[PDB]
Amino acid sequence: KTKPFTLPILTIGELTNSRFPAPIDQLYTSPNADVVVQPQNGRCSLDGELQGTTQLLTTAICSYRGMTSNPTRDYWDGHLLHLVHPNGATYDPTEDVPAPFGTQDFRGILYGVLTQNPRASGDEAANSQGVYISSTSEKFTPKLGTIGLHQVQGNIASNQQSKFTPVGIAVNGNTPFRQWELPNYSGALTLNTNLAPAVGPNFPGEQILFFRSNVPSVQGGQPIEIDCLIPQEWVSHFYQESAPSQSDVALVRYVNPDTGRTIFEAKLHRQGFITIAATGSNPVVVPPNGYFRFDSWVNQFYALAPM
Amino acid sequence: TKPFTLPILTIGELTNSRFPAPIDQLYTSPNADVVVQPQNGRCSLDGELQGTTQLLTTAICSYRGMTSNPTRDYWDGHLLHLVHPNGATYDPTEDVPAPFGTQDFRGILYGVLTQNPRASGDEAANSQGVYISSTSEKFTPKLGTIGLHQVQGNIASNQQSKFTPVGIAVNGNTPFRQWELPNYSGALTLNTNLAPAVGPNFPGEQILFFRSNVPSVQGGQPIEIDCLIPQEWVSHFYQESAPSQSDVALVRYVNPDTGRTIFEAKLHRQGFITIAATGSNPVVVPPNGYFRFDSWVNQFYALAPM
């Protein structure tokens, strides 16, 4: 008995980004000529193998948990956070992982709120500090078990069990948001380890199709766009189903149930990403009620209908 | 007939459906004299969502819309004119208690409001800490508006805004009451379209909850939020839509390595679990275990005691 492969039935307004906790807003395609596309969150094979720093919960993506240090006396990261995995499991740096699960996989400033010991303090927001976690910081060393926290609203308490809840991205004069550049998980000038592989098209006329979110920008005017290979719900679905991949390429179609007609077709690669026959950098427009659907296994030679 | 199933997810692989946080514990209580009628995390076993329940973790206790002009109110300095979290237009005539994901407790929800992106040398320029009290007279989400009380930074008027939840606050006059519903239209108007109240209706049984210890941002006590089924079960039932064969699915919490059943429970068609137990306490489970569907049983099926 061979279990058939399937996608969940979810419209674009029913999908979550697997690289930042936000709904999908757009589908987007680009040749990405001058970058290497190698995200570490939102990585799952079609047969259900999680890779990189990928885990199952939306709440763990770009989240951190652990114990704060004593003050560092550093100009930027006034405290460190000694990490456990988001599920609370002890983190062993010798694990065959790039970093704890859910660690941010871009170079940029992640903004969110650190919460620590409940306080009898009579102040509003007493136990909620706004913090910047820059993955260009010299103290961003999650592979080693520690990251730097730069407080921006309130004061971080030393030596307390703490949770970081992500909210958005900040950009400053020396820290552009670079979604396709990985952090150096062990610190400046070190080599990343245990990475999910880079992805790209391998058929003439094809480009990757991404699930895109415009996430909150808390400093700077540039809209912050984060592209994932598959949405978090697909990670969860493939993990659950673990259907055997019967070829290297699944043919999927985007259907409009209002008309019963498909809008476009695409290849969903066994590695866990989508390509389409398209050129240029632009959104791919879909009807709000439409959804992706698995139609059949095909092979590397299947020529897609162009968009 | 399509077989009913539960997803294979351990306790550390589950999300609270009433607040965006991982499940920390299973927990049981008699909840004496208290009506348990949450509106998030509500889904029947054949995949019908109820109350304000929707599918995304990111929409739970989140809000989206346009801020008003300054109100000059003592507490809610701005209103937020709501759409649903997915951006779909909301209107009060929808057959829902309130926009999807609206908080379903009486208390202060703390989080961050983000608005128009703008170039600035100021850190956190476009991220304001805000309290959304569901006990406020301005908390009328069924009518399309809620009140925002700023606590960190200044809210901008007339801007498209998103609220990202972070935790719960207890201030001088707002105890947290997880089982008391907002008056979604204000106290003078009845709530509508509610997912039904749940309870054991069986001597010696209690509800088993999926519990999260969520961030407590003001007040010295920890805050616990209990849901009837985790968000992943809502998602699973919605997709599968397996027809129910009775009112009660017998389920067993199993350890897949030892092969042992830890306990059995009744998963009710309405979308909640009961166990044969008395008292208020955690229900301890192996970290590698999970509920497994056993069989559909009679609506009056009796359980082995915990």
Author numbering:
A (entry chain B): 221 to 527
B (entry chain A): 222 to 527
From the reporting publication:
HuNoVs interact with histo-blood group antigens (HBGAs) in a strain-specific manner.
The final refined structure of native P domain includes residues 223 to 527, with the exception of a loop region comprising residues 340~342 due to the lack of recognizable electron density. The two monomers of the OIF P dimer are related by a non-crystallographic two-fold axis, which forms the biologically active protrusion of the NoV capsid. The P dimer has a dimension of 55 Å×64 Å×70 Å with an extensively buried interface of 3,500 Å2 between two protomers, including hydrophobic and hydrophilic interacting residues from both P1 and P2 subdomains. The P-loop of the OIF P dimer exhibits a unique conformation, taking a ~90° flip, which results in its extruding out of the flat surface and approaching the opposite protomer. As a result, the majority of the S-loop is covered in the OIF virus. Such structural rearrangements destroy the structural integrity of the conventional GII HBGA binding interfaces that are formed mainly by P- and S-loops. This special structural feature allows the formation of new HBGA binding interface (see below), formed by the B-, T- and N-loops, a scenario that is absent in all other known GII huNoV structures. The glycerol molecule is held firmly inside the HBGA binding pocket by eight direct hydrogen bonds between the hydroxyl groups of the glycerol and the side chains of N392, N394 and T395 from the T-loop, T356 and the main chain of S357 from the N-loop. Interestingly, the glycerol molecule resembles partial structures (C2, C3, and C4 with their hydroxyl groups) of the β-Gal that contributes the vast majority of the interactions with the binding pocket (Compare Fig 5F with Fig 7C), thus explaining the observed interactions.
